[PDB]
Structure 1
Amino acid sequence: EMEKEFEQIDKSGSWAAVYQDIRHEASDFPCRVAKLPKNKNRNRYRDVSPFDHSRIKLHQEDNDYINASLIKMEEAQRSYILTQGPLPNTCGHFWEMVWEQKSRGVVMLNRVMEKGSLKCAQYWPQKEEKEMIFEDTNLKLTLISEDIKSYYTVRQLELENLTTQETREILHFHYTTWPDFGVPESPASFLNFLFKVRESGSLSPEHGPVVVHCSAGIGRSGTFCLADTCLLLMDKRKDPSSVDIKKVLLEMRKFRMGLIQTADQLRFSYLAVIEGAKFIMGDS
């Protein structure tokens, strides 16, 4: 059982030790496309790269590279794209990926400025009347509406493929209160955020995989996917205490390196899942 395991690690203060076992056992696959010199400026961080086997490919012919990985959770029937926060020069690639992969939601878990540095380009419009045009990928993006809440903001966006003149509606879920340092004191607002994403239909299989990102696409982004998949497996399985968070994390790390960047984040993910188990083991 998982609450038990949490108690044992916390009383022992051995989160750092558990976290290292995961690092040592984590997969390593080649990242050759990402390290090509032609792609050095498509990567925000030199030590965070997509494996070649799970990388998302753009349908461009000159350069198909974007720092983005497809995570396929086959038992849970969930797929996610994890990516870095766009760079000033990759905003057009980012929306091209969203278009090509038929995604319906974008989950953003960082602020554009954190700790006094820029963690992400401003890649969506801020006013209805000032749309954005990505000339390189021939896409137009318009803010349709914006619902600001205390812990998160939901935006409706219209993405128009200027070449074909087709349009789709994208939902942008922006969690705005992740603290600059550490992790949230309680998982309550995180879980409420996660269930709003679920309720929107963005995680469902009639759509392309949801795009999740922070700054590197591995820390907070990993916490989000890990919690969603764990909670889904608890629904599906005959034995809900047969779900091992550590096993699930290692399976996801076959698809992108480094998911969950700190022992604090690991602790927090346990907390989110354990608390979330209450509201899906039958609390209407």
Structure 2
Amino acid sequence: MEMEKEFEQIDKSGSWAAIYQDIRHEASDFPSRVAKLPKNKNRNRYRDVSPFDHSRIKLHQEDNDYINASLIKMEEAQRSYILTQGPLPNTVGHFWEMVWEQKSRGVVMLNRVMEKGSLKCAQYWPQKEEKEMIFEDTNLKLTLISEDIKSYYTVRQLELENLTTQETREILHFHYTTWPDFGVPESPASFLNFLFKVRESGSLSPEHGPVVVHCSAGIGRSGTFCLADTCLLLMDKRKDPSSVDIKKVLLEMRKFRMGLIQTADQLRFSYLAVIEGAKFIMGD
């Protein structure tokens, strides 16, 4: 059923809460035993948001391999994403270790460091060229190379150095800075513009490791970004775009990380983004 008609039918009937709860009911439940070990309590931002054991990213170290991060592997769409929490004061070195080990080209940040007057993630990248950051626990150096500030997002070029080998890589930081403190954006136009800037960079392409995507918990805004990208890609490669089922794509993605899309308003916003984005994909 053409999702644009499914959309008007749910909107006229005001059933968004009902659709959303049906997804919550059918979603996968897999063990997260590593996340709940007592040694890992200060590596989790939220007690109720954990990576499944089967899909968690492992750090390459014998001490403790744990980070709150999941690999979302979309077989047909041929896309992979790492979804993670906003880094904590004691996990900023783990965060950059993961970007290095997984060969990521891009980091996508969908939150501000402070929202609603509280800290939602650590200040984990340098704000000035001449003040680099050293992560002594993981042996990495991070330098700000350049910054491009736009009305709805900022793009940064960063240099990450493995201090053990003196290899360096360019990482691109895509920072969406205008998601409102409450609710979802009124129009998806600026979110789609941002998505298209990340795609244009190469950060989502198979020649690199998976893109790292985060917000505060790494399930709500982060879920909206990967759901929209995957649905638009499937509309492109398929003979019949109309066969793309957003609810089924979301349930597939929830096999790899719990809780993706946190509210009925985030579900409706995801539909709006895919419907408006398709008017490019289908040749405009």
- The C-alpha deviation readout for 1:26-73, integer Å capped at 9, x for no partner, is 000000000000000000000000000000000011100000000000
Cα distance in 2 for residues equivalent to 1:89 and 1:124: 14
Cα distance in 2 for residues equivalent to 1:240 and 1:199: 22
Instruction: Tell me by how many angstroms 1:204 deviates.
Output: 0.0
SS at match of 2:17: helix
Instruction: Tell me by how many angstroms 1:183 deviates.
Output: 0.2
State the aligned residue count. 283
Cα distance in 2 for residues equivalent to 1:85 and 1:142: 19
SS at match of 2:57: strand
Cα distance in 1 for residues equivalent to 2:91 and 2:231: 32
RMSD: 0.3
- The C-alpha deviation readout for 1:146-200, integer Å capped at 9, x for no partner, is 0000000000000000000000000000000000000001000000000000000
Instruction: Tell me by how many angstroms 1:8 deviates.
Output: 0.4
Cα distance in 1 for residues equivalent to 2:50 and 2:230: 23
Cα distance in 2 for residues equivalent to 1:209 and 1:174: 17
Cα distance in 2 for residues equivalent to 1:116 and 1:60: 36
Cα distance in 1 for residues equivalent to 2:6 and 2:73: 26
Structure 1 residue ranges, 4+ long, deviating more than 3 angstroms after superposition: none
Cα distance in 2 for residues equivalent to 1:184 and 1:167: 37
- The C-alpha deviation readout for 1:228-273, integer Å capped at 9, x for no partner, is 0000000011110100000000000000000000000000000000
The answer to whether the aligner puts 1:3 opposite 2:4 as a matched pair is yes
Cα distance in 2 for residues equivalent to 1:159 and 1:170: 7
SS at match of 1:196: helix
Cα distance in 1 for residues equivalent to 2:274 and 2:25: 24
Which ranges in structure 1 are unaligned for 5 or more consecutive residues? none
Cα distance in 1 for residues equivalent to 2:6 and 2:40: 43
Residue 34 of structure 1 is matched in structure 2 by 35
The two structures have a TM-score, normalised by structure 1, of 0.99
Instruction: Tell me by how many angstroms 1:207 deviates.
Output: 0.2
Instruction: Tell me by how many angstroms 1:21 deviates.
Output: 0.2
Cα distance in 2 for residues equivalent to 1:60 and 1:108: 26
Instruction: Tell me by how many angstroms 1:125 deviates.
Output: 0.1
- The C-alpha deviation readout for 1:196-232, integer Å capped at 9, x for no partner, is 0000000000000000000000000000000000000
SS at match of 1:282: coil
Cα distance in 2 for residues equivalent to 1:135 and 1:186: 43
Cα distance in 2 for residues equivalent to 1:91 and 1:281: 41
SS at match of 2:205: coil
5 Å-filtered alignment, 1:170-249, equals: 170-249=171-250
- The C-alpha deviation readout for 1:64-84, integer Å capped at 9, x for no partner, is 000000000000000000000
SS at match of 1:158: strand
Instruction: State, as a whole percentage, how many aligned pairs show the same letter.
Output: 99
Instruction: Tell me by how many angstroms 1:136 deviates.
Output: 0.3
The answer to whether the aligner puts 1:266 opposite 2:267 as a matched pair is yes
- The C-alpha deviation readout for 1:89-118, integer Å capped at 9, x for no partner, is 000000000000000000000000000000
